[PDB]
């Protein structure tokens, strides 16, 4: 069924309000409810913790402290401790110190607020400079990768653009907040939660509790959104539930109220990027030198790999003969930043895209042309490598951009805009084209494995189960389509079951746009095992070769006779042929040195391009996207509808990151943007007024699942297109470099306009 525009596995369930999320699941009347008490300092020791008014607030059954933690006190997805409950001291505003179990979610929140805490405040690292200043950083020193010698290259550069600029954070705002439920089950526990990484939940809850892994089970059917936000931040909730269940004897639920959610959970690493970029007089790049300053928050989380991926993506779409990155992952007393769609990718990418925009402007060249001049070569002596030294052999970017440019009416429109600007003085339009080259696979290599388990029942129906978790990306349907396609039966015959650590074990998070790639392979592997069994059985009954038995369109055919798939299965049932199979996949060809910055960490790249058109109000900075034109490479898409969906969704989130979305702390480290009224994601009429998305349809060179390509993250970076276009509107208000900062709020657009006009 692969290739068909089939709907989401739960489309109807959604549309009817019957699709359950964690807070919907039935559960025993004795279930308790959990709220954290949070730190009100950014960097203090606790000298006084009086919790008496908390224990005495109504409905409250238990109050918990780090001292009350049976075993482990660590929710970090990384080898460095991160307490779930504050251990004698606090590290940002919002840090859980104690935990309340009470007979309702209100009661719990209410009492969480009643603690008498005394602190002995300390100096707090809140700005990236204070961080360099104090040496508040992770890893001990920056990570440094160089290919060639930038300094030399730049020294001889016909053209140079030196620059520096800010890329701001980003809060997920998954519509379904963080949430978990722990069910004590004689000896062990069962965890239900809103998570992208059930196996890590299992690991963490186990250690929290002192149990072997085989006593902790994690079931998870679907999330109302995750975007990386639930790649690890689910840990504190699950631990909280488990520990509290162990103590109280009763089931325990905890869902963060939205404010708590934004105060507690990490966000996307904000960056300062400083760059020097040089070209010869033909317009070929000579060299690029980057320094990355990334805000990691108070604990490591997944900062190490995130930052690694920014570095890896610092080449943008372009071949560069000499390149260096210096990556400072700085510790601050703020929200421990984490994964978010793109995982460092869009940050490094934007750094480079800004640099190349600069150079283009600075030699007064058309930026599009300059980029097109520096794409990696088309596929076909020794292939161009990346800065990390991976050969780039799938780069279709040159042609895609050509195709997109004609079909978007690119040339003409630009003239149309110039003319328009020339007749206007209050409003102004910009337009930009930006490419995408995204590398596919966990850069932590051994995470590139996936498992599936498939059952065929005697009525011919199939139960499908894999390690991937569904958070809206349409993973489950693609998994259904693969299995249907391999068994040669209608999708309708394949039912998807909740992800469950006791069904498929040792699974990676559903991340690095690898879910469908690897689980797709895993599902097809169990499926072929199952088909192999039926063929070999039929062949022997009907006299002939198994490869001659055909499974198609819910019929089986052998020896000129044909049956229904069911009839065959009932026959193999009676013949005592196992109708169960596990399936497993590990991505091939991957090897690289994290430290030396050399190797092949990726299997392939996912490409695309977008052309955003916008308008700005020169008085206030107010603005709109008017039109967008995307061409994107999904490989041989497994589901073209679901894919267009991901791209449309990804673009809007990317563009949103570079426009109205802004994180803001006060001078004491308090998050001021901590609710929907203060943090502003694209609202409805923010969609590009004209939204044209089309798939570059061309199979993958590498042997991925039916020659498709991950579409999970790549299309998020198409949002740069918008920020670039916005800056193009500014650059038409004056002769000066606008130096637009991200996010491009109206304020930030007004400032960049004023520079370009050249006034204060």
């Amino acid at each position: 069924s692969v290739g068909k525009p089939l709907p989401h596995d739960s489309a109807r369930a959604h549309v009817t309000g019957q699709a359950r999320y964690l807070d919907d699941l039935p559960c025993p009347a004795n279930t308790l409810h959990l709220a954290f008490g949070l730190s009100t300092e950014a960097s203090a020791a606790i000298t006084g913790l009086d919790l008496e008014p908390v224990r005495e607030s109504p409905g409250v059954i238990a109050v918990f402290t780090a001292a009350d933690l049976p075993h482990d006190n660590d929710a970090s997805p990384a080898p460095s401790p991160e307490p779930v409950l504050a251990t004698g001291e606090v590290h940002f505003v919002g840090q859980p110190i104690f935990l309340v179990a009470a007979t309702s979610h209100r009661a719990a929140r209410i009492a969480a607020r009643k603690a008498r805490i005394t602190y002995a405040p300390r100096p707090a690292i809140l700005t990236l400079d204070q961080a360099l200043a104090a040496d508040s950083r992770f890893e001990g020193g920056p990570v440094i990768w160089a290919r060639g010698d930038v300094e030399t290259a730049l020294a001889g550069a016909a053209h140079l653009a030196e620059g520096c600029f800010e890329i701001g954070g980003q809060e997920h705002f998954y519509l379904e907040g963080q949430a978990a439920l722990a069910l004590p089950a004689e000896g062990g526990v069962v965890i239900h939660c809103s998570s992208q990484h059930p196996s890590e939940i299992q690991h963490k809850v186990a250690h929290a509790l002192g149990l072997a892994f085989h006593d902790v089970r994690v079931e998870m059917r679907r999330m109302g959104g995750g975007f990386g936000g639930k790649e690890s931040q689910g840990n504190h909730l699950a631990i909280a539930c488990a520990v509290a269940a162990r103590a109280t004897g009763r089931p325990c639920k905890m869902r963060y109220d939205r404010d708590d959610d934004m105060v507690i959970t990490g966000k996307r690493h904000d960056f300062r990027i400083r760059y020097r970029i040089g070209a010869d007089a033909s317009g070929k790049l000579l060299g690029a030198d980057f320094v990355h300053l990334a805000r990691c928050g108070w604990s490591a989380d997944l900062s190490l790999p995130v930052c690694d991926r920014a570095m890896l993506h610092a080449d943008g779409s372009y071949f560069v003969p000499a390149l260096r990155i210096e990556s400072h992952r700085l510790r601050t007393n703020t929200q421990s930043n984490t994964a978010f769609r793109g995982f460092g990718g869009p940050q490094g990418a934007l750094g480079m895209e800004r640099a190349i925009e600069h150079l283009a402007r600075g030699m007064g060249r058309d930026p599009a042309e300059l980029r097109a001049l520096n794409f990696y070569d088309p596929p076909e002596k020794k292939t161009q490598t990346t800065h990390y030294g991976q050969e780039v052999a799938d780069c279709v970017l040159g042609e895609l951009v050509t195709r997109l440019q004609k079909s978007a009416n690119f040339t003409t429109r630009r003239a149309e805009i110039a003319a328009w600007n020339s007749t206007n003085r209050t409003l102004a339009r910009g337009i930009a084209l930006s490419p995408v080259k995204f590398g596919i696979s966990f850069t932590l290599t051994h995470l590139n494995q996936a498992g599936a388990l498939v059952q065929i029942y005697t009525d011919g129906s199939v139960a499908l189960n894999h390690g991937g978790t569904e958070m809206g990306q349409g993973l489950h349907a693609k998994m259904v389509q693969v299995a249907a396609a391999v068994l040669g039966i209608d999708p309708v015959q394949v039912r998807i079951t909740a992800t469950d650590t006791s069904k498929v074990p040792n699974t990676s998070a559903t991340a690095a746009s690898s879910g469908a790639d690897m689980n797709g392979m895993a599902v097809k592997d169990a499926c072929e095992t199952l088909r192999g069994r039926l063929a070999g059985f039929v062949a022997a009954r009907e006299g002939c070769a198994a490869r001659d038995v055909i499974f198609d369109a819910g019929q089986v055919q052998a020896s000129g006779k044909s049956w229904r798939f069911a009839e065959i299965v009932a026959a193999a049932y009676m013949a005592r042929i196992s109708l169960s199979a596990t399936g497993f996949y590990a991505t091939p060809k991957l090897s690289w040195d994290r430290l030396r910055g050399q190797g092949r960490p990726f299997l392939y790249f996912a490409y695309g391009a977008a052309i955003t058109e916008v308008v700005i109000d020169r008085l206030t900075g107010e603005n709109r996207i008017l039109r967008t034109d995307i061409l994107h490479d999904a490989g041989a898409s497994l589901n073209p509808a679901l894919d267009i969906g991901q791209i449309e969704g990804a673009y809007v989130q990317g563009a949103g990151w570079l426009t109205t979305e802004e994180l803001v702390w006060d001078h004491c480290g308090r998050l001021m943007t901590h609710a929907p009224s203060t943090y502003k994601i694209p609202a409805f009429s923010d969609r590009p007024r004209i939204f044209n998305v089309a798939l570059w349809d061309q199979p993958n060179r590498e042997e991925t699942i039916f020659r498709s390509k991950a579409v999970g993250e790549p299309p998020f970076l198409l949002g740069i297109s918008a920020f670039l276009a916005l800056h193009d509107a500014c650059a038409a208000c004056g002769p000066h470099w606008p130096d637009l900062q991200a996010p491009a709020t109206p304020e930030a657009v007004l400032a960049a306009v004023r520079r370009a006009e050249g006034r204060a």
């Binding site: 998954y174 209050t426 969906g645 809007v652 943007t673 609710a675 203060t678 409805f684």
Partner: protein
């Protein structure tokens, strides 16, 4: 105390004991699990429910609404959107056809908003769905769905609810209220509840003495007066937008961007004005248009100009027992323009609210009503700027010269919504805007055609 109401086609009698329970809390405690919780702050639409009564039907937020408010009304939730026999609404089928959902979590609320819109044949989707946040889809697929489904005839099972009817004080007459507030000056008056319920959800406060105002028809009337138009305190922002669309287009243009449709449906002017908030987009505009305000304290009927109501941040010219009875607007501007500046156009709050209104005797600037929100702990006219503008020529440089005066008029704040520099800067930017708009110039991004 016991209310009654239609719940998904079926009469339900709830027996009230906490008057402050959100419609959200109550529905999910009932196991009506399809109404989701996304923020509990009016912002996301995940809890969008449909209510009907004599006025008709509209989509509102179940999290802002408290139970007593639905007495005698017909209420539809997601689980009640599809036909009794099991058939999908054109809205629901469309959404599937058009992949209008991905993770699903926001799908119940859109559907409810889309059905209620379908029910009233409304097609202004950008506005109807602005209160419905989706983080997954990019909204495009949802716009197709809406259009797709609009061809289809309305659900009759939904329309059927019209048949219906046809502890905490709930007055039905303004009089009834006056007498009571007169005895209990210390009570909390709930109108639409859009500000008040966040003190319970977010602030975690208990409101001891409570009286609801949305069941009091005489208080929520638009009447014509000799001197103009008399708007009662209970008139909803949605209604006030509807009324202004003729007489006062500019106000209707501003009210369009007041919260969402789901707040607009239930939020009121009386409330907006009694809240008394420096960033509240009602007063700025109304002061600019020089409207009066009416107060009442049992039989009392003081009648100041609106601006004078607001004494200092958190403090208004309001007696014990005295409630905002109404406002009166002039029969006409049309020298009024209104400028809301926010980070994102739809459902956001103002960094700056610039409301300007000048009359010109041919060429000389005659009258100067320039009012602001968000520049000061109170909404106020730009006195020194207003002064410095009288008698003058109505031209760019005239105002270009006068601008600095605002910096004497206000000393704005800095916070997450905007930097003081910018708040000032944009406040002056609005004056240069006003002149340019008033002289045929292209001025507004929102009016630009793709």
């Amino acid at each position: 105390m016991e209310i009654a109401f239609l719940l998904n086609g079926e009469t339900r009698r709830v027996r009230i004991e906490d008057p402050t329970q959100s419609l959200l809390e109550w529905l999910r405690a009932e196991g009506l699990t399809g109404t989701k919780e996304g923020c509990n702050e009016g912002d996301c639409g995940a809890c969008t429910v449909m209510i009907r009564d004599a006025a008709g039907s509209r989509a509102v937020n179940a999290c802002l609404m408290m139970l007593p408010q639905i007495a005698g009304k017909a209420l539809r939730t997601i689980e009640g959107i599809a036909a009794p026999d099991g058939r999908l609404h054109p809205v629901q089928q469309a959404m599937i056809d058009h992949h209008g959902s991905q993770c699903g979590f926001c799908t119940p609320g859109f559907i409810v908003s889309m059905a209620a819109a379908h029910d009233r044949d409304r097609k202004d989707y950008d506005d109807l769905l602005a209160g419905n946040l989706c983080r997954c889809t990019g909204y495009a697929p949802i716009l197709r769905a809406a259009e797709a489904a609009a061809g289809e005839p309305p659900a009759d099972w939904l329309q059927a609810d019209a048949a219906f009817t046809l502890p905490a004080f709930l007055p039905e007459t303004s009089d009834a209220l006056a007498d009571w507030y007169l005895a209990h000056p210390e009570a909390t008056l709930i109108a639409g509840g859009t500000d008040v319920s966040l003190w319970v959800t977010k602030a975690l406060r208990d409101l001891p003495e409570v009286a609801f105002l949305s069941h009091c028809k005489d208080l929520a009337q638009i009447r014509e007066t000799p001197d103009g138009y008399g708007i009662g305190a209970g008139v909803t922002i949605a209604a006030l937008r509807a009324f202004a669309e003729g007489p006062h287009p500019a106000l209707a243009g501003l009210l369009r961007r007041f919260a969402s449709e789901q707040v607009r449906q239930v939020a009121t002017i009386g409330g907006n004005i009694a809240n008394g908030s420096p960033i509240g987009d009602g007063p700025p505009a109304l002061i600019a248009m020089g409207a009066s305000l009416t107060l009442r304290r049992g039989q009392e009927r003081r009648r100041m100009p609106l601006e004078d109501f607001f004494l200092e941040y958190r403090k208004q010219d309001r007696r014990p027992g005295e409630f905002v009875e109404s406002v009166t607007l002039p029969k006409s501007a049309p020298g009024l323009r209104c400028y809301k500046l926010s980070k994102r156009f739809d459902q956001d709050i103002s960094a700056v609210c610039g409301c300007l209104n000048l009359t010109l005797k041919g060429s000389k600037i005659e009258t100067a009503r320039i009012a602001f929100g968000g520049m000061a702990g109170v909404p106020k006219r730009a006195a020194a700027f207003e002064a410095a503008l009288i008698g003058q020529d109505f031209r760019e440089d005239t105002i270009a010269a006068a601008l600095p005066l605002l910096a004497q008029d206000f000393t704005p704040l800095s916070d997450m919504r905007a930097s003081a520099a910018y708040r000032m800067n944009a406040a002056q930017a609005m004056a240069l805007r006003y002149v340019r708009e008033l002289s045929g110039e292209a001025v507004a991004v929102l009016e630009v055609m793709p």
